[PDB]
Structures are given as C-alpha cells and as structure tokens.
C-alpha cells in the first residue's frame, strides 16, 4: 500500500518528464542535446534544477486550480488511464534518442 | 612540523596511550574487582 | 630624560594620593 | 515557540521579525528541519573551503580535468564539467529524500535525554555559526573572482594564513 | 578586637573562612590545567635543551 | 523548557562548610556608596528631596557615561588611531587629516557632521532611550535591544562545562560590582575629560605632561 | 485580515513578514489607503513615461524637457512646487481636479470585481515602475549602462 | 485669540456665517501659518552671517546660494522633493514632532496665556514675512526698486 503509492507516483512522474522532453527536443531545431548540458555552466543548472525542485516538492508554480478542472468521474479515470498510456509511450521512446548519441 | 617536534608529539601520545591509560584502566579494574 | 613619562608629576601625584588616603583612613570608626 | 530547542543564553528566544508567532506546528517543524539542514550543509561547506587547500583527491572527476587543476572556491563550479555536478546533486539528493546512504543504526548513539537535547542545541549553534561563516566565505570569494584583490585580502582563506 | 576604617573596608574579604565546594568540585579542570602546564614546561625545556628544534627558532644569542 | 534542563545537571552545588554543615552567610547599600568615602554628600542632596535625589543619580550616571566615552574618544584620537577612508567626501575630509586635538577635532569636523551626532543623541534622549520612572536610574535601554545584562543568579560557564550562578554581591561579576564600577569610572572620567580640556587649553596637549 | 479584498489565488493572503499582524482597524484602513494611492500613482507613472514622447505640451520649452528623471532638473524648482501643492489640494482636501466632482457607478457584485481589480493593476504597476525608475536612473549616471533605449517597447 | 488692543476682529464676515467646527480648522491654519512665518523670520536673517559647510547638491555649495527667494531655484527640485516630503511627514503623521518633552506640564492659568502670544507672535510674523519676501521679490526681478538694497534692514 504505502510502497505502491510511491511506485504509483513515480510511474506518473517518469511518464510526464519524458513527454516534455520530446516536445522540448523538437523546438530547438525549429547546444543541441547531451552536448548542450556541458555547454551550459553548472551555475545555470544550479538555478534551474532548484526551480524545478521547488515545483516538484512544494508546488510553487505548478499547483493551481486552472490545471484541475471539475470534469466528471467517468472520463477522469479514462483520461488518467490515458495519462499513463501516453506516459509509457513517451517513456520507451526516450531511451532511443539518448542511445542514438554515440551509444549502444 | 620538524622531525624533532613530531617525535615529541609522538612521545607524548605514546606515553598517554601505552603507559598512563593502561595503568589507570588496570587500576580501575582491580579496584572494582577486589 | 628628567621630563620623560610626565616628569616628576606622576610620582608627586602618586605619593600625595597615598599620603592622603592613609590620613583619610587613620581616624577611628566612630 | 519560546519553550523549544534553540533557545540559548546570549540572546534567548530570537525572533525579532515575528516569523514564528502566528505560524502552526508543521511549518515550525519544517523551519527547524530547514535550520538543521542549512546548518549541517554550511558546516560541511566551511570544512570544504579549507581541506582542498591542504589535500586534494588523486584521481579525475572527468577525463578532461583532474582534482588538482580545479581552483578552490566558486571558481570550482565552472571548472568541473556540468554533467558531473548534476550527478552529485542527485546522489546527495537520494540521501536527502530517501536516505540511501544514511539512517544507519550505527552512528546514532542513544544518550541521556537531557544530554541529547544539549547536544542538539550544540548542533544547532554550530550550524547557525557556520551559516554566518559561509556568507563571509562566499562574499570574499565571489567578489575576489570579479575584481581580483577587491577587498585587499587576496587569499581565499583569509583567517588561516598558515595554509599559505 | 579593634575596628579600624580600613579593617571595616577589608572585612568581607576575610569573612569566608572554611567555605568549600562540596565533593570533588573543580578538581577535574585543575588536573587538566596541571597536565597542560606539565606538557608546556617540557616543551620549553626541550627547546632550551635543543631536543626540540623548531623551524625558525635558533637557540643562540640574537642581535637587536 | 526544551534544551534547558542540562543546566541544572551542570550546575555546581551550593557551597558548604568544610566540616560538612551548611555554610552560615554572616553602610554600602546604594550604587556609588563604596568603601573609601562611603556616602560622600557634602551638599546634602539626599536631604533636598526624594525626587531631587533621583534626578541627581540619573544626572551623575548620564554625565559619567558621556565622560567615559569622551575620555576614550580623545585617547584613541590623540594617539593617531583613525577610521579608514573619508569623513567627508564632499569636503575632501579624510580621517587622517582631522587633528587629534580636542579643539582641533571639534573644529575640523563639519557642522553638518556634528548635527548628525547631536540628532542621534536627541533621538536617543527623547524617544528611544527614555528613563522609565519605574525602572532603575540609568536603565534606559529597552527590552528587545541586545544589551549585556547581569541579573541576580545569571549563569557563567567553567572549563568542564559546569555552570555557576553569580549573585549580585559577587566580586568582579555581580551586578553591584559592575554598577559601582560604571559610576566610579564615570566619576573619574568626569574629572578626566575636564582636566584634558583645560590642559589642552593651556598647553595644546590633552594628556599633559604625558607625550 | 484574511477576509478582505485583495486575496487572489497565486499568493492568497500574502503577508510573510506579518506587517498586518496585530494592528487595529484604523491602521489597516490606513494601510489600504496607502496600498491604493501608491498603486494609483504607479499606473499614472507608467502612462507618464510613454505618452509624453508622442505628445508634447504647448519660461521653459515643454518639448525640450527630457522625459524621465531628467525632467526634474529641467523644470524650475519653484515651478515644481506649485504642482506638488496642487496635487495636495486633491489629496488632503479632496478638491477634485481630474474630475469636476466625481461620478462613480456602484454595482454590488461588480464592486468586488472592480476594487480588487483596481489595487492589483496598481500592484503590478508598482512592481513595474521600479524597473522603469531603475532603467532611467542607472542610464542617466552611466549612458548605456545596459545598452538599451529608454522604453523597452518598440513602438516609439 | 482675543487680545485687549482690538476685539473680535472680523471685518469681511468670515466668522459669523461659518460654523465653529470648521472655525477650529482655520485655527490650526492660522497657528501653522504663524509657526511657519515665525521660523521664516529667523530663517531669513541667519544665512547672512552663517552658512552650512558642505554642498547641498552635486556642484551646488551652500556658500554660493542667494539668501532670498532665488534659493528656491538654486537648489534642484529633487532636493526640494526630499525636504518637502520630510516636512509633510512631520506635518501629517507627526513623525518628529510628537515627543512628550515638547508638551510641558503646565498648570491651566499660564497655559491659555502662553497660547495667546503664540498665535500673536505668529500673527505679526505673518505680516513681517509678508514684507520679507516682498522686498526680496521686488529687488530680485529688477535691481534696486526700493531705496534700500539690503534683504535685512538691520
Ligand atoms: C524537461 C523538458 C525539456 C528538455 C529536456 C528540453 C531540452 C532542451 N531544451 Mg527545451 N523546451 C521545453 C522543455 C524541454 N526542453 C518545452 C516544453 C519547450 C516549448 C516551449 C521548450 C523550448 C526550448 C527553448 C526555447 C530552448 C530550449 C533549449 C533546450 C536545450 C538546453 C537545455 C535545457 O533544458 O534548457 C531549458 C531552457 C529553457 C528556456 C526551457 C524552456 C521551457 C519553458 C520555459 C516552458 C516550461 C515552463 C512550464 C512547464 C510551462 C507551463 C507553465 C504554465 C504556462 C502552464 C535542451 C536540449 C534551449 C537551447 O538553447 O536550445 C538547444 C532553448 O533556448 N527548449
Ligand atoms: C535557513 C536559515 C534558518 C531557518 C529556516 C531558521 C529557523 C528558525 N530559527 Mg534560527 N538562525 C539561523 C538560520 C535559520 N533559522 C542563522 C544563520 C542564525 C544566526 C543569526 C540563527 C539564529 C537563531 C536563534 C538564536 C534562534 C533561532 C530560532 C529559529 C526558529 C524560530 C525563528 C523563525 O521564525 O525562523 C524563520 C526563518 C525563516 C523564515 C528564514 C529566514 C528568512 C529571512 C528573511 C532571511 C533574511 C536574510 C538573511 C539575513 C541573509 C542576508 C543576505 C545578505 C546578502 C543581505 C526557527 C526554527 C529560535 C529557535 O531555534 O527556536 C525556539 C532561536 O532561539 N535562530
Ligand atoms: C535532486 C536533489 C535533491 C532532493 C530530492 C532534495 C530533497 C529535499 N531537500 Mg536538499 N539539497 C540538494 C538537492 C536535493 N534535495 C543539494 C544539492 C543541497 C546542498 C548540498 C541540498 C541541501 C538542502 C537544504 C539546505 C534544504 C534542503 C531541503 C530539501 C527538501 C525540500 C525540497 C527542496 O529542495 O526545495 C526546493 C528549493 C527551494 C524551494 C529553494 C531554492 C532556492 C535556494 C536559494 C537555492 C538556490 C541557490 C542558487 C542556485 C545559487 C545562486 C543564487 C543566486 C545567484 C541565484 C527535500 C526533502 C530543505 C528542507 O529540508 O526543508 C525546508 C532545506 O532547507 N536540501
Ligand atoms: C555523497 C554521498 C553520501 C551522502 C550525502 C551521505 C550522507 C550521510 N551519511 Mg553516508 N556513506 C557514503 C556516502 C554518503 N553519505 C558511502 C559511499 C558509504 C559507504 C562507504 C557511506 C557510509 C556511511 C556510514 C557508515 C554512516 C554514514 C552516515 C551519513 C550521515 C553523516 C549523512 C546523512 C552516518 C549515518 O548514516 O547516520 C547516523 C553513518 O553512521 N555513511
Ligand atoms: C506602498 C505599498 C504597499 C502597501 C501600503 C501595502 C499594504 C497592504 N497590502 Mg499589499 N502589495 C504591494 C505594496 C503594498 N502593500 C506590492 C508592490 C504588491 C505586489 C507584490 C502587493 C501585493 C499584496 C497582496 C497579494 C496582498 C497585499 C495585502 C496588503 C495589506 C496587508 C499586508 C500588509 O500589512 O502590508 C504592509 C506593507 C507595508 C507597510 C509596506 C512595506 C514596504 C516594505 C518594507 C518594502 C520592502 C522592499 C520592497 C520589496 C521594495 C524594494 C526596493 C529596493 C530597490 C530597495 C495592506 C493593505 C493583502 C491584501 O491585499 O489585504 C488583505 C494581500 O493579500 N499586498
Ligand atoms: C527637519 C524635519 C523636522 C521638522 C519639520 C520638525 C518639527 C518639529 N519638531 Mg523635530 N526633529 C527632527 C526633525 C524635524 N522636526 C529630527 C530628525 C529629530 C530627531 C533628532 C527631531 C527631534 C525633536 C524633538 C526632541 C522635539 C522636536 C520638536 C519639533 C516641533 C518644534 C520644533 C522646535 C516641530 C513640530 C518638539 C516636539 O516634539 O514637541 C512639539 C521637540 O521637543 N523634534
Ligand atoms: C603607576 C604609575 C607610575 C608611572 O608610570 O610613573 C611614571 C614615572 C616616570 O618617572 C619619571 O621618569 C623619568 C625617567 O624615565 C625621570 O626620572 C623623572 O624624574 C621621573 O619622574 O615612573 C615611575 O614613577 C616608576 C614606576 C615604577 C612602577
Ligand atoms: C467624469 C468621471 O467622473 O468619470 C470618470 C470616472 C471613472 C470611471 C472612475 C474613470 C476612471 C478611472 C481610470 C481612468 C482608470 C484607468 C485605469 C488604468 C489607466 C490602468 C492601467 C494599467 C497600468 C499598468 C498595470 C501598467 C503596467 C505596465 C507594465 C506591465 C510594464 O511593464 C511597464 C512598461 O514600462 C515597461 C517596464 C517596459 C515597456 O516596454 C512597457 C511598459 C511601458 C508597459 C474615468 C474613465 O476617468 C471616468
Ligand atoms: C519556470 C518554472 C515553472 C515550472 C517548472 C512550471 C510547471 C508547471 N506549471 Mg507553472 N507557472 C510558472 C512557472 C513554472 N511552471 C510561472 C507562472 C505559472 C502559472 C501557472 C498556471 C496558472 C498553471 C501552471 C501549471 C504548471 C504545471 C503544468 C507544471 C507543474 C498548471 C498547474 O498548476 O496544474 C495543476 C496551471 O494551471 N503554471
Ligand atoms: C508633501 C508634504 C506635505 C504634506 C503631506 C502637508 C500636509 C498638510 N499641510 Mg503642510 N506644508 C508643507 C508640506 C506638506 N504639508 C511644507 C513644505 C510647508 C512649508 C512651506 C507647509 C506649510 C503649511 C502651512 C502654513 C499649512 C499647512 C497645512 C497642511 C495640512 C492641510 C493640507 C493643506 O492645506 O495643503 C496638511 C496636513 C495647513 C493646515 O493645517 O490648515 C488646515 C496650513 O495652514 N502646511
Ligand atoms: C554506473 C553507471 C555510470 C555510468 C555509465 C557513468 C558514466 C560517466 N560518469 Mg559517472 N557516476 C556514477 C555512475 C556512472 N557514471 C556514480 C554512481 C557516481 C557517484 C559516485 C558518479 C559521479 C560522477 C561525477 C562527479 C562525474 C561523473 C562523470 C561520468 C562520465 C565520465 C566520462 C565523460 O566525461 O563523459 C561518464 C559518462 C563525469 C562527467 O559527467 O563529465 C562530463 C563527472 O564529472 N560521474
């Protein structure tokens, strides 16, 4: 129960970050990939990671009523099951892009 | 830290470690035992 | 050299202070 | 919250801005947990500003840069590759959230309850002092990076001249 | 006994005869200071004896 | 309540007689009334009135306090000790170019600068540090302001971590000792600062004949 | 004072320092009046930074007056003072100059949706004029401090 | 404010129709006008012999400032903004004019006496100021309008 809730929350969260990475990977071609993380100074990552961590833990800029409509319970679980299926679809997709950058 | 200074510090540490502390511990043990 | 460190001022003031305190404390209590 | 841990002799209960008068319990527990961890990190930060001036690690963080080439201070941040810094954050972040390499049964001594609160106030007091120390270390280091010898104290660890 | 002006002044300084701290008191702190004094006396003896040679300390007659 | 009970275990026990029994405790009651002269009141200000006498106690305390600061002010300034930088950047007044002499420092310092010193004293005297009639004379620092206070039974700490409570009558550490030492150093500096003024008026040396 | 106008979802009852804690109702109305009046000037300050560029006014030339903090030295100090006291006529005594007498509409549910909208547009303007005053003053002492024009919007 | 030389001085009908609640507002308006005027009289004669040491604005020393109304335009307006606003904090809030030491513990009988010459000293000072900035303004526009060319006639 208690352990399953942590696995449940991690499954959703891992599926999310994979989704924003995919859309976040096509805007740059419209400083490319893993070559970019070394190009940006680590002081830049210190500011950005902690800003994500504020949203991740406290919900500073990521917990608002505009993102949670009332809707209805019949399609809520239908959309929430859809949240995982798209999350998994982006999850298995992601590894091929990082392995493409001169890896196995 | 010159070798003579290090030798003095080692001598003080050695005297406390293998003379003062073992004799005191033995005295405490035989005093509580007897 | 005789005027160094105030001259004779501190020994004169110091000796006068000791003599005045002894005379102040010399009297009986009541 | 006057009758809590952290009240010590020179000041007593220190709260001049009133940041704890109208707060609840759970924010105070978060405040003390923040104070304890801010102090613990600042205590290690003070140690981490002095030890590399004496001894360095022999290997390499990354194949490009070794430990000895890394300049001590805020100049260290840009010298080491950014991918290495991101791995350290999540490594100590795993111990921060879960405690993968912490919460061990050894290293947590059980003591007298009054002795335990005394050592806990000592832990807070050292952390509070090191938090003040980390501000001076960072202020002297960062300003000396922008303008070399801005304040005129040149050396990184100004108060310990025997290191240099 | 005679009461004098200075005697009345100095009276509280001699008014605590026989007052002790119960038990061992501060003997543990005193033993630490005695032990530190013993180590300090050995240091300055061995410096004078040239059994401890320091870095920039030369035990010989100095100038100025 | 939390983190305070370690003091009671670290507190040293009460002093006893050497035999084992409890120790029997077995003129100078007012601050400023001490061994050498006792109550030295040639003008009998205490006989003028209780309100008039309380005024003179606060008046001696205040006069003595500024005199101690004034004496220490000249002694460092006449020695050549200076703050680093400019006293007046608009007037090109470095601290090094301000004379150590009392009249020299009184004249060279700009009147706009002297106003700022005076207005700080006016602000302290009129609003911030007012004498409370209920409070003791000279107790003008309000609560909340960080001030070194020595209440009866305050804690001091020894080498092993043991705690001793200091009564008011303790030598060098009690409240009455520090209260008396403030009045007397104030009285001595009151004669000192006036003597340094007149000696410098006559000779130009505040600490004449020293120097 | 949680149950009062100005509470809006991102911050809620924003009071970290606790300046509204343990104050009487007269001080909060005073705080509210200072909240409103500071805001109202800041909206007009934002307007008074862009509109004196395109439109000018008819012993100092109105067009030659540089917009921003440089206007203070250009206008005579005596000429500045009767403007200051004229605003005080509408401030203390309330002798309305922008209007004749003042004709405000009152709609019950819109009153909550206007008064709350009034102070927070002013709150945003107060946050905005800090940048507007910073860029003008820092560039005046050092021409091209950040190497930018006077107004970040490009329609001038 | 009734003084023995004159009586209820009101020639233009400014106290009968108007109510007594707002008549107190003219009383503060009269007292504050006189208090400004009283300080302006002494404040007009002091800068002749003594001036402040430094500068008031960058490039504007205290010494090379005309004592009259030309000092208004000599000091920059932002300098005037700081001075006017600090005065208004005392004027409205009573920031630096509310200390209890400025309210002496006086018995009744000499109190309403002392308030009587307070507005009376300010009353002549209002007219005395009205001559001070008059002769200053005439001589500032055109030099030597009146026979005398001195700001203070004494
Ligand atoms: C975690 C998701 C993610 C990842 C891994 C990437 C990948 C990358 N992006 Mg990127 N991005 C994302 C999200 C992501 N993107 C999204 C959703 C968009 C569409 C708006 C973009 C648009 C974008 C831009 C415009 C740029 C990058 C850049 C980069 C590269 C530099 C490293 C970096 O992350 O800087 C991140 C730096 C950013 C400025 C990220 C922008 C994300 C914005 C602020 C939206 C996110 C906030 C929030 C979720 C929005 C919703 C709030 C509310 C309105 C509901 C790297 C390859 C930079 C690079 O130089 O190109 C190679 C660069 O300039 N991306
Ligand atoms: C992260 C830092 C941090 C946090 C969260 C706390 C938290 C706490 N402290 Mg505390 N402390 C700290 C660091 C901290 N401390 C430092 C550095 C000192 C030395 C000055 C102290 C000295 C101290 C004493 C002596 C006592 C406390 C007490 C407390 C408790 C109640 C007071 C309160 O409401 O705090 C809330 C804290 C915050 C809301 C965070 C601070 C935010 C302010 C605005 C920061 C101000 C800027 C700062 C000075 C940096 C300046 C940067 C410079 C460039 C300008 C609470 C558990 C009391 C106690 O422990 O419990 C009874 C107590 O007696 N503190
Ligand atoms: C992924 C890594 C990770 C994880 C999972 C955690 C886990 C946690 N931490 Mg750690 N932590 C990390 C990284 C991490 N930490 C690192 C690298 C350090 C330094 C060794 C710390 C030291 C630390 C402290 C001192 C505290 C935590 C707290 C917390 C908790 C609150 C969540 C949070 O971080 O707030 C998100 C962060 C914020 C809301 C503040 C971010 C802004 C600050 C000022 C940092 C930014 C500094 C900036 C980059 C430097 C430039 C400054 C300027 C020029 C821009 C959470 C349990 C807090 C706690 O336990 O209770 C409150 C707490 O006080 N952690
Ligand atoms: C950067 C990695 C990291 C971090 C953040 C910590 C964090 C901590 N550890 Mg762990 N430690 C680590 C690496 C780390 N450790 C590794 C690789 C080992 C195995 C050699 C250990 C073995 C270890 C022991 C044996 C103990 C700690 C203890 C601690 C605490 C002191 C602190 C919370 C102590 C503990 O966890 O709390 C009492 C303690 O007794 N650590
Ligand atoms: C003149 C400015 C001013 C004044 C008088 C007020 C006053 C008030 N605000 Mg409000 N506010 C302001 C500015 C102000 N605020 C700004 C700029 C914002 C946008 C961030 C807000 C956003 C805001 C919210 C979201 C809420 C309030 C609320 C309130 C009320 C209760 C809180 C309080 O006691 O504040 C007292 C404040 C003061 C006495 C002024 C403090 C000024 C500090 C010391 C300045 C600190 C420095 C500042 C950041 C500028 C730095 C510049 C730098 C270059 C030095 C009260 C009517 C609450 C509400 O509306 O009513 C229930 C509430 O929920 N305000
Ligand atoms: C320049 C601004 C200014 C203004 C317009 C005033 C105005 C006033 N003050 Mg303040 N004063 C000021 C600056 C000012 N003061 C400052 C900065 C301080 C702190 C040093 C004082 C300290 C002060 C005291 C101690 C007293 C005044 C008094 C007065 C009143 C009579 C002055 C004679 C008058 C209302 C008196 C007042 O408080 O009672 C009416 C009085 O006793 N003032
Ligand atoms: C106590 C103050 C003593 C003091 O320093 O006096 C200052 C006086 C200075 O003594 C002066 O010294 C000069 C030579 O240095 C000349 O001899 C002066 O005549 C002599 O008065 O010193 C002493 O009285 C000796 C103090 C010993 C203690
Ligand atoms: C006769 C009578 O009684 O009728 C009256 C009664 C009644 C109803 C009361 C009336 C009223 C009141 C009125 C007129 C109310 C008006 C409301 C008003 C005027 C509200 C504006 C918003 C300002 C903001 C938030 C600005 C933000 C600006 C922002 C976001 C900035 O960043 C500033 C900026 O500079 C930067 C930093 C960079 C630049 O690149 C861009 C700009 C310049 C934008 C009327 C209509 O008069 C009629
Ligand atoms: C730059 C850092 C940053 C991150 C990383 C981040 C992330 C998220 N934002 Mg946020 N955001 C800002 C910044 C950031 N946001 C600045 C204003 C702002 C405004 C809103 C509003 C109105 C909503 C909002 C949301 C989310 C949610 C998707 C994710 C977690 C929605 C929401 O909270 O869904 C429950 C929502 O309705 N945001
Ligand atoms: C921005 C700063 C500021 C504010 C906020 C402010 C406020 C008020 N002033 Mg003050 N005032 C100045 C500045 C400010 N005044 C300056 C620099 C001077 C010297 C030149 C000055 C002198 C007078 C005189 C002679 C009188 C006077 C009064 C009022 C009163 C009525 C409002 C009004 O009339 O404008 C309100 C509280 C009169 C009064 O109380 O009558 C009922 C009155 O007779 N003032
Ligand atoms: C087991 C899986 C694993 C792989 C496959 C892997 C690989 C690389 N790591 Mg390593 N790593 C760990 C594990 C793994 N690492 C662990 C458990 C820790 C915590 C002790 C850790 C810490 C650091 C730090 C501090 C740095 C670091 C680096 C590299 C880099 C070196 C070649 C390169 O430069 O690309 C290659 C990719 C450096 C870096 O990223 O520089 C850009 C760097 O500074 N790592």
């Amino acid at each position: 129960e208690e352990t399953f809730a942590q696995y449940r929350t991690a499954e959703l969260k891992h599926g999310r970050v994979a989704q924003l990475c995919v859309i976040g990977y096509i805007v740059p071609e419209i400083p490319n990939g893993v070559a970019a993380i070394n190009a940006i100074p680590a002081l830049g990552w210190f500011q950005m990671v902690f800003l994500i961590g504020a949203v991740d833990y406290w919900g500073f800029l990521g917990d608002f009523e505009a993102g949670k409509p009332d809707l209805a319970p019949e399609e809520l679980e239908k959309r929430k099951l859809q949240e995982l299926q798209h999350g998994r679809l982006a999850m298995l997709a992601v590894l091929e892009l990082l392995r493409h950058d001169s890896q196995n | 830290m010159t070798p003579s200074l290090s030798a003095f510090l080692s001598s003080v540490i050695l005297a406390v470690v293998i003379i003062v502390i073992p004799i005191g511990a033995a005295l405490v043990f035989v005093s509580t035992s007897d | 050299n005789a005027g160094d460190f105030g001259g004779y001022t501190i020994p004169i003031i110091g000796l006068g202070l000791i003599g005045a305190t002894i005379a102040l404390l010399a009297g009986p209590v009541d | 919250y006057e009758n809590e841990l952290g009240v010590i002799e020179p000041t007593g209960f220190f709260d001049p801005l009133g940041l704890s008068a109208n707060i609840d319990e759970e924010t105070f527990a978060q405040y003390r947990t923040a104070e304890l961890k801010h102090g613990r990190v600042a205590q290690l930060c003070v140690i981490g500003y002095v030890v590399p001036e004496i001894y360095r690690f022999p290997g390499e963080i990354a194949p490009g840069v070794a430990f000895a080439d890394i300049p001590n201070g805020v100049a260290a941040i840009n010298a080491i590759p950014s991918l290495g810094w991101l791995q350290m954050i999540f490594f100590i972040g795993a111990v921060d959230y879960w405690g993968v390499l912490g919460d061990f049964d050894i290293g947590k001594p059980k003591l007298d309850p009054d002795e335990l609160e005394k050592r806990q106030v000592q832990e807070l007091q050292h952390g509070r002092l090191a938090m003040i120390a980390t501000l001076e270390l960072l202020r002297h280091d960062s300003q000396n990076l922008v303008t070399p010898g801005f304040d005129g104290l040149d050396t990184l660890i100004t108060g310990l001249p025997f290191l240099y | 006994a005679l009461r004098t002006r200075l005697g009345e002044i100095l009276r509280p300084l001699n008014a605590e005869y026989g007052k002790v701290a119960p038990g061992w008191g501060t003997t543990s702190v005193m033993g630490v200071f005695m032990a530190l004094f013993l180590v300090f006396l050995v240091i300055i003896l061995q410096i004078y004896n040239s059994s401890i040679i320091l870095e920039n300390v030369d035990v010989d007659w100095v100038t100025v | 309540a939390k983190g305070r009970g370690w003091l009671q275990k670290a507190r040293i026990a009460d002093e006893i007689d050497v035999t084992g029994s409890q120790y029997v405790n077995v003129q100078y009651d007012e601050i400023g009334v001490l061994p050498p002269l006792g109550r030295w009141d040639p003008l009998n200000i205490k006989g003028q009135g209780e309100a008039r006498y309380r005024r003179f106690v606060e008046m001696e305390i205040k006069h003595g306090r500024m005199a101690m600061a004034a004496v220490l002010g000249v002694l460092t300034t006449y020695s050549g000790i200076r703050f680093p930088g400019y006293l007046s950047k608009t007037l090109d007044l470095k601290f090094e170019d301000v004379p150590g002499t009392m009249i020299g420092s009184w004249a060279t310092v700009p009147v706009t600068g002297w106003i700022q010193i005076v207005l700080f004293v006016v602000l302290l005297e009129a609003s911030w540090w007012k004498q409370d009639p209920a409070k003791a004379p000279g107790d003008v620092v309000p609560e909340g302001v960080w001030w070194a206070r020595y209440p009866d039974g305050y804690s001091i700490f020894l080498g092993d971590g043991s705690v001793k409570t200091v009564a008011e009558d303790e030598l060098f550490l009690g409240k009455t000792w520090k209260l008396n030492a403030e009045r007397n150093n104030g009285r001595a500096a009151m004669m000192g600062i006036t003597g340094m003024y007149v000696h410098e008026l006559l000779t130009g040396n505040p600490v004449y004949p020293l120097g």
Side-chain angles (χ1 to χ4, degrees), chain A residues 37-38 40 42 45-46 57-58, chain D residues 30 77 81-83 85 89 97:
Chain A
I37 52 86
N38 179 223
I40 308 205
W45 298 99
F46 288 168
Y57 190 99
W58 311 103
Chain D
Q30 175 230 354
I77 312 179
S82 148
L83 191 51
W85 261 125
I89 287 173
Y97 201 77

Side-chain angles (χ1 to χ4, degrees), chain A residues 43 46-47 50 53-54 57-58, chain D residues 30 33-34 37-38 41 89-90 92-93 96-97:
Chain A
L43 197 42
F46 288 168
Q47 285 141 136
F50 276 125
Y57 190 99
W58 311 103
Chain D
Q30 175 230 354
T33 317
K37 211 190 307 333
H38 264 92
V41 169
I89 287 173
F90 281 86
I92 73 198
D96 206 336
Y97 201 77

Side-chain angles (χ1 to χ4, degrees), chain E residues 2-3 7 19 21 47 54:
Chain E
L2 181 68
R3 312 201 335 281
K19 196 190 197 187
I47 286 171
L54 289 178

Side-chain angles (χ1 to χ4, degrees), chain D residues 2-9 11 14 112 114 117-118 121, chain F residues 1-7 9-10 146-147 155 157 160-161:
Chain D
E2 288 90 27
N3 293 266
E4 304 278 346
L5 288 210
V7 192
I8 208 55
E9 222 68 26
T11 69
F14 179 51
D112 177 17
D114 271 279
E117 313 196 28
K118 174 186 147 148
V121 176
Chain F
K2 287 189 128 23
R4 306 257 57 191
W6 66 268
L7 297 153
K9 288 150 217 283
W146 282 359
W147 206 255
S155 305
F157 306 96
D160 44 10

Side-chain angles (χ1 to χ4, degrees), chain F residues 63-64 67-68 71 184-199 206:
Chain F
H63 269 87
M68 291 188 262
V71 160
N184 283 136
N185 280 263
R187 286 156 178 178
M190 275 192 282
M191 293 300 339
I193 193 57
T194 53
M196 290 165 69
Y197 176 55
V198 296
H199 282 191

